[PDB]
Amino acid sequence: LHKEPATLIKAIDGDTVKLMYKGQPMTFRLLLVDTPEFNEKYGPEASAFHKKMDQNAKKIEVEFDKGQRTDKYGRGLAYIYADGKMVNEALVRQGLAKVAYVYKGNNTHEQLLRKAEAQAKKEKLNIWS
Ligand SMILES: Cc1cn([C@H]2C[C@H](OP(=O)(O)O)[C@@H](COP(=O)(O)O)O2)c(=O)[nH]c1=O
Ligand SMILES: [Ca+2]
Numbered sequence: 001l002h003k004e005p006a007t008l009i010k011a012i013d014g015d016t017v018k019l020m021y022k023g024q025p026m027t028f029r030l031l032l033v034d035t036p037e038f039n040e041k042y043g044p045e046a047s048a049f050h051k052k053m054d055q056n057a058k059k060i061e062v063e064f065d066k067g068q069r070t071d072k073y074g075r076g077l078a079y080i081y082a083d084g085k086m087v088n089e090a091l092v093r094q095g096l097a098k099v100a101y102v103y104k105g106n107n108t109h110e111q112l113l114r115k116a117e118a119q120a121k122k123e124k125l126n127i128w129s
Contacts, residue, residue, distance in 0.1 A: 014046025029075040034100035057082035067106035082129030
């Protein structure tokens with residue numbers, strides 16, 4: 001996999017964000033995770049965590065996996081990095097997302113993220129509290 005540039009356009013929620021990619025506005029949905037909807041418990045906290053991470057970043061990058069790059073709603077599917085740190089993983093490590101939606105052929109970082117989820121659960125963080 002490789003990292004490609006993007007710039008933040010706007011926060012959306014815990015697991016989606018509006019980015020400019022190859023000069024076009026797209027909504028991105030984070031691979032391999034599910035944050036609570038803003039209406040649900042820890043939704044606000046997930047949104048805020050995601051928003052802060054991306055807005056504090058100097059450099060946002062997107063990394064597509066081997067499979068589908070857009071989902072059925074036209075959202076980009078990617079691992080998103082904020083100054084080299086993977087947002088998807090950070091959400092799971094903080095107990096603000098579950099590993100989820102692991103479809104074969106776009107699951108390169110599955111085991112990395114499950115390792116994070118296990119550490120979050122052990123610490124009883126947020127969703128695992
Ligand atoms: C994360 C992800 C979600 N999706 C689709 C599956 C779910 O369809 P449904 O809308 O029919 O439930 C939905 C979950 O996204 P959200 O969690 O953002 O709702 O997005 C994919 O197709 N590929 C993916 O990699
Ligand atoms: Ca969600």
